[PDB]
Design a protein around this ligand. Structure first.
Ligand SMILES: CCCCCCCCCCCCCCCCCC(=O)OC[C@H](COP(=O)([O-])OCC(O)COP(=O)([O-])OC[C@@H](COC(=O)CCCCCCCCCCCCCCCCC)OC(=O)CCCCCCCCCCCCCCCCC)OC(=O)CCCCCCCCCCCCCCCCC
Ligand SMILES: CCCCCCCCCCCCCCCCCC(=O)OC[C@H](COP(=O)([O-])OCC[N+](C)(C)C)OC(=O)CCCCCCCCCCCCCCCCC
Ligand SMILES: CCCCCCCCCCCCCCCCCC(=O)OC[C@H](COP(=O)([O-])OCC[N+](C)(C)C)OC(=O)CCCCCCCCCCCCCCCCC
Ligand SMILES: CCCCCCCC/C=C/CCCCCCCC(=O)OC[C@H](COP(=O)(O)OCCN)OC(=O)CCCCCCC/C=C/CCCCCCCC
Ligand SMILES: CCCCCCCC/C=C\CCCCCCCC(=O)OC[C@H](COP(=O)(O)OCCN)OC(=O)CCCCCCC/C=C/CCCCCCCC
Ligand SMILES: CCCCCCCC/C=C\CCCCCCCC(=O)OC[C@H](COP(=O)(O)OCCN)OC(=O)CCCCCCC/C=C\CCCCCCCC
Ligand SMILES: CCCCCCCC/C=C\CCCCCCCC(=O)OC[C@H](COP(=O)(O)OCCN)OC(=O)CCCCCCC/C=C\CCCCCCCC
Ligand SMILES: CCCCCCCC/C=C\CCCCCCCC(=O)O[C@H](COC(=O)CCCCCCC/C=C/CCCCCCCC)COP(=O)(O)OCCN
Ligand SMILES: CCCCCCCCCCCCCCCCCC(=O)OC[C@H](COP(=O)(O)OCCN)OC(=O)CCCCCCCCCCCCCCCCC
Ligand SMILES: *P(=O)(O)OCC(C)(C)[C@H](O)C(=O)NCCC(=O)NCCSC(=O)CCCCCCCCCCCCC
Lengths: 87, 128, 603, 178, 104, 102, 125, 87
């Protein structure tokens, strides 16, 4: 019924959420932008980003895996792997 | 400040409210590491067997075998007629029998006495 | 002859027909759901015909076609009672089932076993028809157990869900307590009347006693989920939405009320059982409404509303008004099925989301669903000229003007107010306000199947109570004279509930946060009944089953008394006998002792 | 679920999990988005106020008090995502998940109904059977003499190898198998 | 097993068990289809007290309402022919005690 | 925490293998190879499914069920004052003259 | 519901009537000439019409007329409004007669209380 | 059929009131009765006529077994097995 997800759509949506975040400069934001190394965030900000992704995609990321997603590309890979997206 | 949560048998204490979860000694970390090591060893053995391509059948579980053996075939050899066991067995095996015997005997005696006195409504009772 | 019995039996037979065709390529293909829906619609028309026949001359018949077996002086035969209740409930059930089947054609489109789902729905319908048309206690029990086990199968539709499995088992347990009551009633009736059929039961039981009527009441409470045995109905929402719409709320949970209606002569004869029925219904409706007003799952809210309506029906039976209960059964079937269909449409549109805290903006997002749900909630609360007006208003008026329990009357009024309150909660948290669902908007309700099914159940939520109430003969004396403040009691309490619920819902927009109250925690946690009564008795029974019966008695003491003690005694005696050293001096001395004993102590 | 657990949760992990739980329960209480944003900002203000604390004993005491406050003030019926454990759609499709070992019990006619799929399946089976010895050798080379100390598996060091114990992870059933 | 962690990668995801680990003596009782000991938002004693108080209060008020019933300021319903003596099954041979109703 | 290099590399390799597995799980255009082996619909449905059961049941009731006593019992029709009994050509008389109540 | 419940339960239950035991006084007590109620429909007519035993009250003839009207004009169920109104008015008159009986019992009980209190006062002094 | 004894199975005479309509609307019950007679009753009557014609081609009879009266247990002597069996 619902249209299937794709890698490009997942990347677009996660970058959309990150660009809507007010503590991230959209011009310096890319899929390889580390949240703490080159974006200057901290643990609480990373937790809030993970929660925003959970709200965006309508599913919960366990805390054991959420503490390791430090890149938009990593978030995309996790979502695609969980949703069984291969294209 | 806030009302305290009182744990029970069926309402066990949550892990975030356990006082021992915040008083950690270096020995506790060693115990946790040992537990993790044991779990990892068991997991590695199971995963090797599970991912073996030539395996065709059921991976026998020694823990399951021990549980089934202990619950069924290991009870009597480890039984000693202590006063507790004697009293509990006598109660739970005899008391209900005499209770039901007394109840049914009283009921049937009352019914028989009513029938003999001829004051029991037995009309339309032609199927017994 | 007469086209009455022939057409009733023909409706039953054509209902049974597609089950036989389940072993064919029609069942193997994807036309089976449409085939079943067409069969149900044809059955609905062919059942409408005898309803027209009854409303003209009031014709009632019983058909005893097949003789099963004669137990000496008791004859059990396949008998059908095509009276007013049967000929009025069959078309309503068929109409609701037709609408639910179309809704399920739309809804369970991606399910690999949609054919099996429709087969199970048809089997449930057949069992319900058997229960309704049964003329004797044995056939009634057959229908009872058939609908129970079909409910068990359909609640656990997703076999991989532990919650679904435990919900199905819990429903079976409560229905089995009800069956205990039913079997008590059957045994008493056979023993004291030599009959299992209603005609001879009514002929011989001029003053029905407490034991059989309490058995019937217990069976009805178990089936209709009254207080004490209620929690299975809210937990039965683990199944697919079509199952909740058709089976539980509409047609299955009214089985206990229907059973109590069928024995209304005996209920009239007794008084204590009437009082107990009234009290049970009052406490049930009050408790279920109070739990409903604070739930966040829409299916659970509708389930608790159904339980409250069942409690109201039980109250109506307790005040000696059997026919008003039947009228309420029909109207409630209509608008409750429509409400469940609307909730299912909302859930499907929002990607299997069943939380009003995530629903929002649906007033303009989903126009037709919003209209249908508003009409259903107006009918549920007793809008002065909808389907719910011709039953609930009369029920409230009859409760007011009766020699009943004051506490029961007060609880009934409070339950009506709480009904308005939770209807307001559903509407406010589901349709008004701003969206709270995920940004990807997949809302689409333009499916002809969904639209047509909701539309058919929507015309019946406006123009059905009027027709039904104007086309039935008067079976009760009306309450023409009453005070003005009592004539509009239902409207006043309904408006009070509306206003209070709306105020408390508007207070949620304020930027103020406070911790919950004891009353809120009690109401949201379902009164703590599921926790205590599902943890303590189960733990104690499962503990005594292992500690006492299995280990202590079977594995230890039953082994110790007969076989182990005898074996030990024999082993000790064998050791004593055979422990001889083979010394001729010793056993010749034993020979001498034996000789002396035989010579002296033997005369 | 995809990550091997550690022996214990550090203080940072404990406070982050408490923060996420508190935010989720606050969202459950604060249904509307603006109210939730206001109170979530207040909650993060509290966390940032307590963020800088050199005394670990005092930090642990604050964490314990915060956990007690959360347990007292938690939502009795918190929001749960439908597919998450405890959700209304949790484990719904577990009955539709059928494995490839069931798939290889098919009849020859059924297999002939799908000719192209089973050629690739045979290729996958050969690939699995040609790597098991290398996988077990790599696993036994990298383990400490006592045994594994964690549930983390090594990757494939060589170009022609595959990460050991990959078959079931790769060939697990789809989340919507039917 | 309900108390056990749901997000861990168990060897038996439905039972939430690992291969080789010791099995509780009462696993048959503590499966997710049976007795649950998971923590509750409200203490067990408080829940029991509230439930018992609610049911006891309801029973007491039902008894109070039974001994103080509600009715309407009307007389008994009047029926003809000796309060329908023959219609309710009275013996035709015997003559019932007359019941006479007067206008008012 | 974060991804160690070993964990990241293993995850990358597993993702590659899983995506290739799913791509293989796709089907071919030819893949399902089957063996070689409405007024009309509603009319053919109405004759059998409705007309045959009603014929069978009417035949069973009129000649077998009603061949035995008391198998089919009908509640007697309600007789009102001022009526005509059709069986015997009888006339059931009217009631008294109602006193007007306004 | 009503003030009578409050009077009986929070006042003088002796002066308030008992619904399950009334009437207590003789029907002719205070009525020099009282007319027995008249029943129009006969027992045989009610039996043939198969009225329910609760419906076989003194208003049964209007119910019989309503049933005959409804049966004759079957397809047009919006027909017997006049018969329905006549039956409702007859039931209303029966109910107001019951209310008159209740009020008579109430004030007879209070008159008895006044008389016995006056007698007690006379006996005392 | 009425192949049973009316005295053994009594049935009061059936009084059916004559139809006296008071409205101009047609009777759907009457129309449906006509349709039922045209579509069902006539075909089943024809089928039954054919079947009964076939039955009358070869007509055979069965009898009700009559049992003689024998002396009863009151007249039977003690330990008289044959008389006891008959009784
Ligand atoms: C052992 C006891 C046994 C009792 C048996 C008898 C039971 C009787 C029940 C009576 C009715 C109960 C109503 C619901 C109570 C629960 C409310 C709730 O949970 O709301 C949350 C829920 C919303 O929750 P949420 O949106 O998720 O957010 C929750 C908040 O975050 C956080 O929520 P919150 O907690 O902040 O909000 C709750 C708050 C606000 O809610 C209310 O105030 C609800 C009641 C509204 C007022 C009702 C009375 C006023 C109107 C009638 C006045 C008299 C009229 C007389 C004449 C009538 C005829 C003309 O209420 C309270 O704090 C206390 C309420 C006490 C109610 C009385 C019964 C329980 C007493 C228990 C003892 C302890 C009490 C203190 C609390 C615990 C300790 C701290 O509220 C609703 O959905 C609406 C609730 C109100 C509906 C009212 C409908 C009408 C009620 C009947 C009116 C009269 C009708 C006619 C009667 C017959 C006349 C002849
Ligand atoms: C008839 C057969 C009787 C057999 C009695 C016998 O050998 O009992 C065993 C016993 C000896 O059993 P035992 O010595 O093994 O008892 C040990 C018991 N526990 C372990 C509980 C402390 O013999 C006697 O008691 C002698 C009985 C003599 C005859 C009495 C009459
Ligand atoms: C006489 C000719 C009339 C004109 C032509 C009519 C159409 C042509 C066919 C002949 C129809 C004859 C009249 C029939 C009734 C028509 C409707 C009517 O009068 O309604 C009155 C009433 C409506 O009257 P009312 O009460 O609303 O009128 C109120 C009037 N005012 C407001 C002015 C006071 O409706 C009904 O009775 C409802 C009928 C429902 C029928 C449901 C479908 C039945 C399907 C049966 C299928 C199976 C058939 C075969 C069975 C045997 C087995 C094979
Ligand atoms: C006389 C016959 C016995 C009468 C009842 C006596 C007590 C019954 C003993 C029950 C034995 C327990 C067997 C255990 C089977 C498995 C239990 C089980 O599956 O778990 C509990 C299971 C499901 O757990 P959940 O709450 O759904 O948790 C889900 C979490 N996601 O719940 C149950 O089924 C237990 C219900 C036990 C019923 C006890 C309450 C019945 C007492 C009320 C009787 C009074 C009725 C009043 C009406 C009177 C009318 C005149
Ligand atoms: C005394 C007067 C009152 C007597 C009682 C009157 C009850 C009236 C009930 C409805 C009237 C009968 C309508 C007949 C509908 C069945 C016709 C049928 O079989 O299908 C035709 C047709 C199309 O069906 P599909 O599923 O789309 O098939 C498409 C094929 N390609 O059916 C329809 O949809 C007609 C639309 C129905 C309009 C909505 C009617 C709502 C009725 C509400 C009240 C009905 C309650 C049921 C009985 C009430 C009394 C207990
Ligand atoms: C394709 C169908 C065949 C097409 C031709 C149409 C058949 C026309 C029917 C003519 C023959 C009918 C006939 O022979 O009737 C008699 C014949 C048997 O004679 P009896 O006297 O009734 O048996 C007494 C046993 N002690 O009856 C039948 O065979 C018809 C029975 C059909 C009724 C439905 C069967 C119900 C069985 C359900 C399973 C058991 C349910 C238990 C009942 C519980 C009762 C409390
Ligand atoms: C009654 C007055 C007469 C007195 C004599 C009574 C004779 C009749 C009673 C004896 C019953 C015959 C069966 C017992 C014979 C002896 C059995 C015996 O030797 O017991 C020891 C025996 C040793 O077995 P091994 O092969 O050597 O090693 C394995 C150990 N598990 O222990 C066992 O486990 C054997 C199981 C035998 C139990 C058989 C079940 C007996 C049932 C008795 C029911 C009540 C009988 C009433 C008397
Ligand atoms: C006045 C109201 C009574 C209400 C009853 C409520 C239920 C309480 C009764 C049953 C509870 C269990 C009592 C019997 C079980 C024995 C207790 C026991 O095991 O004690 C032993 C030691 O044995 C004793 O102490 C014996 C004391 C009790 C003896 C009672 C009198 C003996 C009765 C003789 C009759 C036995 C047969 C009864 C059935 C016969 C057929 C009816 C050791 O206990 P521990 O678990 O190790 O320590 C726990 C400390 N809290
Ligand atoms: C909130 C509740 C507030 C009121 C609580 C009152 C508690 C006490 C109570 O109800 O007393 C009423 C009393 C009960 O007495 P009772 O048990 O009926 O005695 C008859 C002997 N078999 O009643 C009496 O003694 C007389 C009752 C008179 C009315 C009976 C109506 C039927
Ligand atoms: P990130 O990696 O940048 O690092 C942040 C952390 C917090 C890990 C720090 O590095 C750190 O460890 N700092 C010192 C330790 C510390 O801050 N301890 C105290 C923090 S916990 C605390 O203060 C919480 C108190 C407020 C929140 C209480 C929650 C109660 C509300 C429950 C409501 C539920 C329903 C509404």
């Amino acid at each position: 019924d619902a249209p299937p997800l794709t890698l490009e759509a997942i990347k677009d949506r996660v970058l959309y959420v990150l660009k809507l975040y007010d503590k991230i400069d959209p011009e310096k934001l890319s899929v390889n932008s580390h949240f703490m190394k080159d974006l200057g965030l901290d643990s609480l900000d990373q937790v809030e980003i993970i929660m925003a992704m959970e709200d965006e995609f309508g599913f919960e990321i366990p805390d054991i895996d959420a503490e390791k997603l430090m890149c938009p590309q990593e978030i995309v890979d996790y979502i695609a792997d969980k949703k069984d997206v291969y294209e | 400040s806030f009302p305290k949560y009182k744990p029970s048998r069926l309402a066990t204490l949550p892990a975030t409210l356990d006082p021992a979860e915040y008083d950690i000694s270096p020995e506790t970390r060693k115990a946790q590491a040992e537990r993790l090591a044991i779990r990892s060893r068991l997991k590695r053995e199971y995963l090797l067997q599970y991912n073996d391509p030539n395996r065709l059948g059921v991976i026998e579980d020694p823990a399951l075998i021990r549980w089934t053996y202990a619950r069924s075939a290991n009870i009597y050899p480890n039984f000693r007629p202590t006063p507790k066991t004697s009293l509990l067995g006598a109660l739970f095996g005899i008391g209900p029998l005499f209770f039901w015997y007394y109840v049914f005997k009283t009921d049937r005696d009352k019914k028989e006495k009513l029938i003999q006195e001829g004051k029991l409504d037995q009309t339309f009772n032609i199927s017994y | 002859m007469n086209p009455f019995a022939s057409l009733t039996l023909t409706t039953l037979t054509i209902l049974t027909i597609p089950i036989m065709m389940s072993n064919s390529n029609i069942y193997k293909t994807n036309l089976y759901p449409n085939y079943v829906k067409t069969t149900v619609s044809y059955a609905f028309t062919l059942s409408l015909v005898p309803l027209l026949m009854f409303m003209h001359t009031g014709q009632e018949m019983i058909i005893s076609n097949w003789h099963w077996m004669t137990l000496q002086t008791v004859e059990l035969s396949l008998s059908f009672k095509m009276d007013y209740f049967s000929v009025m409930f069959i078309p309503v059930a068929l109409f609701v089932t037709w609408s639910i089947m179309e809704f399920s054609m739309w809804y369970m489109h991606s399910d690999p076993f949609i054919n099996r789902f429709f087969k199970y729905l048809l089997l449930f319908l057949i069992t319900m028809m058997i229960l309704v048309t049964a003329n004797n206690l044995f056939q009634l029990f057959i229908g009872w157990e058939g609908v129970g086990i079909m409910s068990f199968l359909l609640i656990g539709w997703w076999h991989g869900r532990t919650d679904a499995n435990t919900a199905a088992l819990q429903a079976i347990l409560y229905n089995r307590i009800g069956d205990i009551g039913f079997v008590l009633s059957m045994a008493w009736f056979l023993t004291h009347s030599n009959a299992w059929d209603l005609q001879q039961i009514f002929m011989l039981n001029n003053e029905c006693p407490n034991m059989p009527l309490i058995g019937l009441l217990l069976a009805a409470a178990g089936k209709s989920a009254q207080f004490g045995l209620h929690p299975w109905l809210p937990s039965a929402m683990e199944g697919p939405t079509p199952v909740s719409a058709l089976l539980h709320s509409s047609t299955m949970v009214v089985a206990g009320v229907f059973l109590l209606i069928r024995f209304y002569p005996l209920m009239e004869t007794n008084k204590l059982v009437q009082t107990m029925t009234l009290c049970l219904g009052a406490i049930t409706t009050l408790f279920t409404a109070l739990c409903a007003i604070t739930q966040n799952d829409i299916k659970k809210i509708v389930a608790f509303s159904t339980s409250s309506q069942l409690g109201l029906m039980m109250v109506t039976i307790g005040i000696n008004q059997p026919h008003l209960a039947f009228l309420h059964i029909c109207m409630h079937a209509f608008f409750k099925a429509m409400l469940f269909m609307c909730s299912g449409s909302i859930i499907h549109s929002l990607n299997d989301e069943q939380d009003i805290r995530k629903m929002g903006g649906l007033y303009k997002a989903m126009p037709f669903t919003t209209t249908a749900l508003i009409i259903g909630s107006l009918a549920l609360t007793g809008m002065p000229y909808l389907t719910g007006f011709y039953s609930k208003d009369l029920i409230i008026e009859a409760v007011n003007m009766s020699y009943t329990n004051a506490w029961a009357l007060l609880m009934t009024l409070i339950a009506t107010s709480l009904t308005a309150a939770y209807s307001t909660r559903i509407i406010f948290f589901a349709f008004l306000g701003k969206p709270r669902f995920p940004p990807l908007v997949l809302i689409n309700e333009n499916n002809p199947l969904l639209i047509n099914s909701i539309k058919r159940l929507l015309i019946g939520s406006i123009f059905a109570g009027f027709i039904i109430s104007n086309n039935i003969p008067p079976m009760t004396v009306p309450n023409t004279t009453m005070p003005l403040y009592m004539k509009m009691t239902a409207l006043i309490v309904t408006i009070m509930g509306f206003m209070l619920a709306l105020e408390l819902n508007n207070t949620t927009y304020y930027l103020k946060f406070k911790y919950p109250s004891q009353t809120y925690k009690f109401s949201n946690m379902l009164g703590y009944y599921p926790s205590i009564m599902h943890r303590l008795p189960t733990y104690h029974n499962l503990s005594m089953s292992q500690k006492s019966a299995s280990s202590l008695l079977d594995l230890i003491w039953l082994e110790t008394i007969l076989p182990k003690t005898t074996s030990f005694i024999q082993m000790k005696m064998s050791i004593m006998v055979s422990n001889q050293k083979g010394l001729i001096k010793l056993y010749f001395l034993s020979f001498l002792i034996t000789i002396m004993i035989s010579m002296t102590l033997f005369n | 679920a995809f990550s091997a657990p550690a022996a214990y949760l550090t203080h940072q992990q404990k406070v982050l999990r408490l923060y996420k739980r508190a935010l989720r329960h606050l969202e459950s209480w604060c249904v509307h988005r603006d109210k939730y944003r206001y109170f979530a900002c207040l909650m993060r203000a509290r966390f940032d106020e307590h963020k800088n604390e050199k005394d670990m004993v005092k930090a642990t005491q604050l964490l314990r008090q915060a956990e007690e406050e959360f347990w007292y003030g938690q939502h009795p019926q918190p929001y749960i995502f439908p597919e998450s454990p405890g959700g209304t759609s949790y484990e719904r499709y577990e009955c539709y998940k059928v494995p490839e070992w069931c798939l290889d019990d098919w009849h020859p006619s059924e297999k002939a109904m799908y000719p192209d799929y089973f050629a690739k399946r045979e290729q996958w089976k050969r690939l699995r059977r040609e790597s098991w010895e290398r996988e077990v050798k790599q696993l036994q080379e990298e383990t400490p003499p006592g045994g594994p100390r964690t549930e983390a598996l090594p990757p494939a060091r060589k170009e022609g190898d595959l990460p050991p114990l990959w078959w079931h992870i790769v060939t697990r059933p789809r989340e919507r198998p039917m | 097993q309900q108390e056990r962690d749901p997000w861990y990668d168990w060897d038996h995801p439905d039972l939430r068990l690992n291969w080789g680990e010791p099995i509780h003596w009462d696993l048959d009782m503590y499966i997710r289809n049976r007795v649950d000991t998971s923590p509750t938002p409200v203490s067990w004693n408080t829940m029991c007290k509230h439930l018992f108080g609610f049911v006891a209060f309801m029973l007491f008020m039902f008894w109070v309402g039974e001994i103080y019933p509600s009715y309407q300021p009307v007389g008994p319903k009047q029926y003809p022919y000796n309060d329908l003596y023959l219609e309710r099954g009275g013996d035709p041979t015997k003559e019932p005690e007359p019941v006479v109703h007067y206008e008012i | 925490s974060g991804y160690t290099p070993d964990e990241k590399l293993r995850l990358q390799q597993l993702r590659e293998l899983r995506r290739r597995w799913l791509k293989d799980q796709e089907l071919s255009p030819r893949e399902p190879v089957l063996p070689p082996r409405k007024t009309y619909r509603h009319s053919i449905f109405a004759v059998t499914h409705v007309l045959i059961p009603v014929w069978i049941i009417h035949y069973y009731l009129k000649y077998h069920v009603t061949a035995k006593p008391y198998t089919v019992v009908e509640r007697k029709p309600r007789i009102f004052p001022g009526d005509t009994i059709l069986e015997t050509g009888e006339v059931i008389p009217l009631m008294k003259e109602f006193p007007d109540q306004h | 519901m009503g003030a009578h419940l409050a009077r009986r339960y929070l006042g003088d239950a002796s002066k308030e009537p008992d619904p399950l035991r009334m009437p207590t006084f003789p029907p002719d007590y205070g009525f020099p000439e009282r007319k027995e109620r008249e029943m129009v429909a006969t027992q045989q007519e009610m039996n043939d019409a198969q009225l329910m035993l609760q419906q076989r009250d003194y208003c049964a003839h209007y119910l019989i007329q309503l049933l005959k009207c409804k049966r004759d004009s079957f397809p047009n169920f919006l027909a017997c409004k006049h018969e329905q109104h006549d039956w409702d008015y007859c039931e209303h008159l029966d109910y107001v007669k019951r209310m008159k009986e209740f009020e008579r019992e109430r004030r007879l009980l209070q008159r008895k209380k006044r008389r016995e209190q006056r007698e007690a006062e006379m006996a005392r002094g | 059929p009425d192949s049973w004894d009316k005295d053994v199975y009594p049935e009061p005479p059936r009084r059916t009131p004559a139809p006296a309509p008071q409205t101009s609307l047609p009777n759907p019950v009457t129309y449906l009765t006509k349709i039922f007679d045209l579509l069902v009753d006539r075909p089943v009557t024809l089928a039954r006529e054919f079947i009964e014609q076939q039955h009358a081609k070869n007509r055979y009879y069965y009898y009700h077994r009559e049992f003689r009266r024998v002396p009863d247990i009151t007249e039977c002597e003690e330990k008289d097995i044959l008389c006891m069996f008959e009784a």
